[PDB]
Every structure is written in C-alpha cells, then in structure tokens.
Enzyme design. Structure first.
Site, PDB file in Angstrom:
ATOM      1  CG  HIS A 276      -4.476 -10.937 109.663  1.00  0.00           C
ATOM      2  ND1 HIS A 276      -5.056 -12.131 110.190  1.00  0.00           N
ATOM      3  CD2 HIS A 276      -3.264 -10.854 109.757  1.00  0.00           C
ATOM      4  CE1 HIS A 276      -4.164 -13.072 110.284  1.00  0.00           C
ATOM      5  NE2 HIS A 276      -2.886 -12.121 110.160  1.00  0.00           N
TER       6      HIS A 276
ATOM      7  CE  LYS B 270       4.426 -13.098 115.490  1.00  0.00           C
ATOM      8  NZ  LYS B 270       2.935 -13.520 115.216  1.00  0.00           N
TER       9      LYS B 270
HETATM   10 MG    MG Z   1      -0.323 -12.894 113.335  1.00  0.00          MG
END
Ligand code: MG
Ligand code: CAP
Ligand code: CAP
Ligand code: MG
Ligand code: MG
Lengths: 455, 455, 160
Positions: free
Chosen positions: C147, C26
């Site tokens: 994902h 992040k």
């Molecule tokens: Mg993500």
C-alpha cells in the site's frame, strides 16, 4: 579399475586398530555384482567410494590423501563378510562447538556405497567408535532415571513403567483424546502420541495438549500418583518443533517435568532428533523409528540393521528408542534382539562384531512396543532378563474388554507376575484385570497358555 | 484379525478419488508373508497400520475415526499391486504457518508398515498429491533460472551447466582444494563439495571457504565469466547449518548469489533440507541423496523408489536433486529413469501409476552425476532429450590426462557435440580436449567408440 | 509470492487465473472486532478478497488480536457457507520491525490451515522500504500487499 593395492591392507590387526584409537570400524555383509571385480576388488572400490576416492584415478590425489584412506582390513568371502576401518579425521565436525555429527558418519560409511553399480548389496551389521570420536557425540542428557524420579520410584532399578499409545492412531478429537488418557492413567504411568498424531485439522495441536494437560491433573488428583505423557513434536521445520515443545512445557507448568518429547527420527532424520536433544536437553527424548523396517528388516540385504540404528541413536542423544518386541509382538523381530538393549543400556557391551566401551555415556532406554499385551509380557521379560524399561501397548490396553483403565492394570499385573516368578495362569486367578486379558485376546491366550479356560 | 470390511473398498473408482481432490493416493508392490492372511487382508491391515488402526479392535474408535480411514481401493494380486487412498486430513500441519510436512507423509505411507510381521515386503512406486495438499508444501524457491542468470545465460533454456566435484573426496587441504577449483573454473561453470567435505580437521571449514572464495575471484577475473560453487552445509545441528551458510554468504560478498548450498537430504533427513530451504530460500538448494540406494535400488523390494524420492524432493523445496545417470554411469540406473527428470521439471507429467499436476510449483533441476565423463555424455543426452541441467563429473574432469581445466572443456565440448548432432569420433578431430578424453578413459572409449584410435 | 499463489488457493488456473473480486472494510476506522468480522462475512458471500483499510491495526476500540480472531472465524463461516476459498490481507505495518513480526506470526498461527489464504499489507511509502523488506524477508510465502499511502506528495503530476 583395481584399487585393492591402495584401499585394502589385510595385514592390519583389528586388535591393533582398536588399541590405536584412530579408526572407526564397520562390518558389512556384502556381495559383488556378477560381471565385475572379485570380492577384494569390490571391497576396495567400496572403501574408495566411502572415503577419499572415486571410480578412476585423479591427478589431485597426494600422499596425505592416501594416508586417510578407509582400508579393508578383513574379509571372508565364504561368509560375505567385509570390515573397513575409517580414519576418524574423515568425519565432519561442527564449526560452532567442534562436536561430531552422525550425518557425516552415515554419509561416509553407508552413503553412496549403497548405490554402487558393481555391488549387488551391502549392509552394515556393526560398528566401533573409539574414545577420541565417541566423546564428541552428544549422548543422552535425560534417561529413565529422570522418569523414575518423577514417578517417585528408586532412581536405581526403578522398575517397569506401564505405558500405552492412544488409539485410534488418528481420528480422536481433542476431548475424546484426553478422556482416553485419563482412563488409562487411572491404572498406568506413561502415555504417548501415536507417531503421526500432532496438529491434524480435526485435532488441533494446542487444543489437544490443553485437554491432555487437564486430564493429567485430574488423573493425578484422583490417583494420588504422578503421570507422564510423551508428545510428538516431529516436523520438517526446526522452528515448528521448538514451537510445539515450548507451548507444551508452558501449558503443563508444574507438570512440565512429566513431559517427554517424541521424534520420528528415521523419517525426519538426525537433524530432527538433534533439534529436540539440544533444544530440550532436560526433556526425555523419545526416539520413534517408523520406516526403519525398509532397511533393518532381515529380508533386506541393504542399509543397516536395527542394532546399528539403536547404537547410533544413543550417540545422537535419544533418552529412549524403540528396540522392537524381539519376536514377541506384531512387528518383525527375534529373541536375539535383546543384545540391542544391552548395547544401549550398559557402559560396555558386545555387538555381533565389535565390543564397545561407552565411557560413562548415559544409557538409552529400550522402549518396547508393537502388538504387545499382558499375555505376551511374561515371555518377553524372560528373554530380556529385566524390566527396567518403558513398554507401550496401545491395542493391548484400549483393546481390553473392560476398558483402558483395566488394560493399564493388566500390564502392571503382567510385569508383577514375572517379577514374582509366578505362573501366569495361577497368578491370574487372583488378579481380575490380568485374567480378563485372556478374554480380551483369546487367540493369544490359546497359543501361549493352553487350557487356560479350564483353570 | 480380518479388517478388510473396514479398510478396503475396491468399489471406489480412482478417477473419482482424483476428481474429489481429498485423497493422497499411493501405489505399492506388496507381498504377504506366508502363514498369515491373503492379499486383501494383508492390504487392509497395511492400510490400518498406516492411518487410524492397529492389529486389534479398540473401544475408543468412533465414526469420525472411521471416516478418515485409509482405504485400499484397487488390487492386482497377479502383479502384487496395492493402491491405498489416504484422506488428506490425516497428514500433520505446522502450527506456525499451517503448511505441510513431508515427515508426516513418510510416517503414514511408508513408516510403521515397513516393519509389519505379516508382510514380506512392500515398496511405494508412485503417489498422487491433490491441489488442496500440494499447495501446502514449500516447493522450490530457487531454480536453474537463477544459476543461468548468474552465468549470463537466457533464463529460458539457458542450456548445459558444466560442473564437477572436487576430488579426492577427502584429503585436500584448504589451498590445494582451492587450486583445483581454479583449474576447473578455467573451463567449467559449476563446482560442488563432495558430499562429506565440510569441517575436517585437515581442511577447516572457514579456511576452505575463504580459499575457494579467493579462487572464484581469480577465475572470474581470468576468464571474465561468472563461476558457481555449491558448499556442503549438512549438519545434525540446525544452528550449525545456519552458521556455515551465513559465513559463506558473508565471505563471498558480491559473489553471494553465485553460491548454492548442498544438503545430504537422505541421511540428514527432510529436516535438514527444510532448514536450508527456509533459512536460505534465495540460495540454490542442492539436494544430495547419499544413502538412498539402500531402498531405491531395484535389488530392494522395500521402502520407495528413486522416482518417489525425487517427487518428494520437489515438494520439499530442492532446487536440484541427483536423479542418477540413468544407466550411463557408475551407479545403478536405467534408461527409463528419464521419467524422473520429467516429473521434477514439467508442470504436468506421468508417473508409473498417477498423473501429477504441479500447479506452477517451481521445477527441480535434475543433477546428473556418478561416473560420468565426456565420452559417456552424448549417449546420456540422447536418452534424456535435453541438456537444460547440471552435470558434475569428478573423475571425469580431474581424471583427464591433461588436468581439470582440460577435463572441464571436454565436458563442455561433449555437450556441444550432442547439440550439434555430430559424430563423437569426427567431432573429436577438431576439439583437442574432447579427443584427449578418449586417451584419458580408453576402456570407455573402446566400448563406446570402437576403432577410435584409427580415426 | 505472486497472484499465481492467490489463484491456486481460489482454485483458478495458475496462469491467467482471472479477476479477483475484492474490497476494503469500511468504515476506514470505527468498527469493533465482531461488527468488523460480520462485514467480512457478508462480502465474502459474493467476493474473494478482503483487506484492512490502510490504517486498521491495533486501535483501542478494535484490538489487533481480537479482530484477527474474529476475521479468522468469519473466513471459516464464509468458506463453509459458499464452499469457496476466501482471502484476507492484514495490515502489519509498524515502526518496530519486531511489531511487524509479532503481528504476522500471530495471524498465520490463528488462521492455521487457512494460513495460505493470508496476505500481509504494508504501507511501504510512509513506513519505507525497510518495512517492505521486513515483510518480504520474514514472510516470503505470504502475498505482500504494498500500500502506497502518502505517495501522492511526490508522484502527483502537480508535483515537479
Ligand atoms: Mg484505504
Ligand atoms: O503404531 C504402532 O503400531 C505402535 O504405536 C504400536 O501400537 P500397538 O501397541 O497397538 O501395537 C508403535 O508405533 C509400533 O510398535 C512401532 O514399532 P516398533 O516399536 O517395532 O518400532
Ligand atoms: O561421490 C561421488 O561418487 C559423486 O561425487 C560422483 O563422483 P564422480 O563424478 O567422480 O564419479 C556423487 O556424489 C555421486 O554421483 C552421487 O550419486 P548419485 O548422483 O547417483 O546419487
Ligand atoms: Mg504407533
Ligand atoms: Mg559425491
């Protein structure tokens, strides 16, 4: 089970089999195991296991199958000799281009028959390929002719190519590796990877070729002479081999025709040799035979000889193959091995049992390597009779007391000494690098040239 | 030159080398040649020629090089035993995926050292691969589990796969070939090309594939049971192998997962094995070892043993490999060869010198073949201890007096007799095809089951 | 490929090898190549596994090849510092089959002897099974990280 009635016909003439052009011929030194069949019975089962049969009769055999049987046409129990003729229709062909594959020749002529329980040992010493089968093999697309052209030499009898192997065999990082290349090229022509050098974690592949490529340009700018390098691109994976070759040619750019490709053909197999031969037909294919000694050694009575190996390499397409020092180096070898060189270089030559016509198939260079140095070269050229070849001396070059550059020149002057027919000791009096080889290898100098220090 | 101080350190402990996980270990049976160095000197030169050095000192060697030297760490001259530790940084890696290649392992541990003039012979009997190096090998992608699943068997201990080889070895035309496939499939599970069968002029590849494909559909429709076939795709040209495999899978269509690919991995080489392994990972890779007997035979004291070959084959990715009949067939073999099967099937097994942890790498099926038939099977399973394997009997099936279909069932019944622990002679009283195998091979019946005619 | 193959790289038992500590880099987007790699290094000092955030790839501010090279360098520095093996899962999702190959091929080559430390992340739901199969069949020996971004449009219980 006695299959001699089917798989043995000693009434056939070798001269008629050859003239027929329908049979591959193989000569073996075989000895039956005790407690089984006699010589002809064993040779028959040997032929059955090498063509169309097994150890028992099967209902599926028909008269057509019997027509393509491999046949024992000659035996000499006193000398343990066995000759077998294989119909050429037995050997596998490519679907994509109808060409021959040495893998099929190996599977039939020296495959399962090496594990037979009723045979103590059997080793192939020679084989004959007729035109109809010979012409289906790739053959070499590049020869020493193409290395000579790059060096500026005559393309006919261009002469001796001074060479070496980078030593240590492993351990040099990219830039130390390239520094050694530059040093040798100051006096030499040809450098090759040691057979296992490639992409070791301590010497990444791409980092090393870039450093060598820079060394080649620096050496060529310094000496005004062209320099050659042979990179090892051996790999299990076909696509790994291509990746290494493509990156090399692109990196060396206008020096791409200075590049040869080394393949460990014996341990990686014909498939690896054919990968380089067909993917880079315009790059000199350097056949390295590490591991061959497990079968080729005279101490071994199984497999096949180095002569057979060299002859097969020419069919596979090797631009050059190691033929050994012929007794003058550190590896096993004998003076009679010069017949191997003639067989792979000439359009026609004699083997220990069969004469071969090559029908203009390109020659394979005899690459001489294995404990060689300037002191051992004159005697080697005396035995062979010519120097139109590549010789690599790793220890013989970088083991020189004055460095690799001096080692390179010692090899150059050694072959000049033989070409001039001069006495090595007297010749050394006017050639420092050659004379310093005597101090570099005093044990060799003492045995080869007694009282050399006094002169 | 004596290099024992650099390339020999007998004070190293094998238990620490293993625990360190930074060394490949190799055990050799070596004998120095008369007239050279003693045992430790020869073993030191052997290690030098197998890692970083040559036969003389060179100016280019640095300390980093010395750090990756292969070291002789254990000797027992009385038994001609030599153990060498190879730092794993020596072995080549792919540029494209950073995985290991068996070609590098072979070049260093059993390459040039097989041609050393100061060694009479040397043969590798075992080797150890630590985790850091083991996990870099392909390993098998397809196992017997997938064949069991196609047959509808349990994927754990699915049992015996009845198999055969199409005989004659060569000579059958496409449709006669397929008819023999149908006959056997009526009582058997598995059929494979004989090692040299492929694209012979008299049996074109695509015509044979189509005919065998049709035979499989007819046999499965007739028996309601799934059938398997193993096609030989061996070739020198990587792209010939792809061509054959891609055509087979397309032709068989919904039976594509019934297909295994056979590779003559010893004569064609690791490169050919890897081509099939990486191009067709979801097709059972059938490793055939024709020619191996030239080095693995106990008559040979060079190269490596069959145990070494099988262990490498598992790293290379073979779904199954021929392990021999362990003395019960027509090829050379001994009862102790069962240790080879355990080494390729278990997650942990003992070699003659090193224990191996496989870290969950898939197993390689032991493929039993070589002069086997119903009569010889009970004894073979007693020595092995299980029947979770593939066994092929060419002559044992099509040599059956009543044909291939009856021969197939005789192999089935032979393993059922062993599973039931019944007496073969008594078991044959209630199983026709098995009893007729006694009549098919009376010489085997007389030796294995005396007085079988009276019962 | 299964978690078994990640356990092997980490030196864990190949059966029930246990918990793999992981994170996502992040910000989801915005980090430039070297700050991206610096965050990877920091986490690996205590963790095992790092993956691209699902949309991270070849943004103009974070070129793909520059980021891959910086992450590769960070992996060696973290492994040499901790003496432990580290894993990374790269996003190779793309509309173009050959874009997925190009990305995966460059990653494996760049990581070299750490190539078996690499997983390949695919946004299987928005890119589709065709993209999953590309990664599955092109790189069978690389852990395929599926994902499922966008799945909530149908899988949510709020959806019928
Ligand atoms: Mg993500
Ligand atoms: O590793 C080696 O020993 C060599 O580089 C020679 O090194 P040196 O120049 O230092 O002796 C060659 O690979 C062998 O000669 C191969 O044997 P052959 O040519 O007989 O196949
Ligand atoms: O050609 C042959 O002889 C076989 O088909 C056996 O045939 P049969 O069943 O008819 O005897 C096998 O290829 C050998 O067994 C290989 O030897 P190994 O497995 O020992 O490597
Ligand atoms: Mg060498
Ligand atoms: Mg066979």
């Amino acid at each position: 089970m006695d299959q001699s009635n089917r798989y043995a016909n000693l009434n056939l003439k070798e001269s008629e089999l050859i003239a027929g052009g329908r049979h591959v011929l193989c000569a073996y030194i075989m000895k039956p195991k005790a407690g089984f069949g006699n010589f002809i019975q064993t040779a028959a089962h040997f032929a059955a296991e090498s063509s169309t049969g097994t150890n028992v009769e099967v209902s599926t055999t028909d008269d057509f199958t019997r027509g393509v049987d491999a046949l024992v046409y000659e035996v000499d129990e006193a000398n343990s000799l066995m000759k077998i003729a294989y119909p050429i229709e037995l050997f596998d062909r490519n679907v994509i281009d109808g060409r021959a594959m040495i893998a099929s020749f190996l599977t039939l002529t020296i495959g399962n028959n090496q594990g037979m329980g009723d045979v103590e040992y059997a080793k192939m010493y020679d084989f004959y390929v007729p035109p109809a089968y010979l012409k289906l093999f790739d053959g070499p697309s590049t020869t020493i002719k193409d290395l000579w052209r790059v060096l500026g030499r005559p393309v006919i009898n261009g002469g001796f190519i001074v060479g070496t192997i980078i030593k240590p065999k492993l351990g040099l990082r990219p830039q130390p590796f390239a520094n050694a290349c530059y040093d040798f090229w100051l006096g030499g022509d040809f450098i090759c990877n040691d057979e296992p050098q490639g992409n070791q974690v301590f010497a990444p592949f791409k980092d090393t070729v870039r450093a060598v490529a820079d060394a080649m340009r620096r050496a060529q700018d310094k000496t005004g002479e062209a320099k050659l390098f042979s990179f090892n691109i051996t790999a299990d994976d076909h696509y790994e081999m291509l990746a290494r070759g493509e990156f090399i040619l692109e990196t060396f750019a206008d020096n791409a025709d200075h590049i040869a490709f080394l393949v460990d053909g014996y341990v990686a197999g014909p498939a690896a040799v054919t990968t380089a031969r067909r993917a880079f037909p315009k790059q000199y294919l350097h056949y390295h035979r590490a591991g061959h000694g497990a079968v080729t050694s005279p101490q071994s009575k199984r497999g096949y000889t180095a002569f057979v190996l060299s002859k097969m390499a020419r069919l596979q397409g090797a631009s050059g193959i190691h033929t050994g020092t012929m007794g003058f180096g550190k590896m096993e070898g004998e003076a009679a091995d010069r017949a191997i060189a003639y067989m792979i270089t000439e359009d026609a030559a004699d083997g220990p049992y069969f004469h071969q016509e090559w029908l203009g198939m390109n020659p394979t260079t005899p690459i001489i390597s294995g404990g060689m140095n300037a002191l051992r070269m004159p005697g080697f050229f005396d035995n062979l009779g010519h120097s139109n070849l590549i010789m690599t001396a790793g220890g013989g070059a970088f083991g020189h007391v004055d460095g690799g550059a001096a080692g390179a020149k010692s090899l150059r002057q050694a072959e000049q000494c033989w070409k001039q027919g001069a006495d090595p000791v007297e010749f050394a009096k006017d050639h420092r690098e050659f004379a310093r080889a005597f101090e570099s290898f005093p044990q060799d100098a003492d045995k080869l040239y007694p009282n050399w220090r006094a002169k």
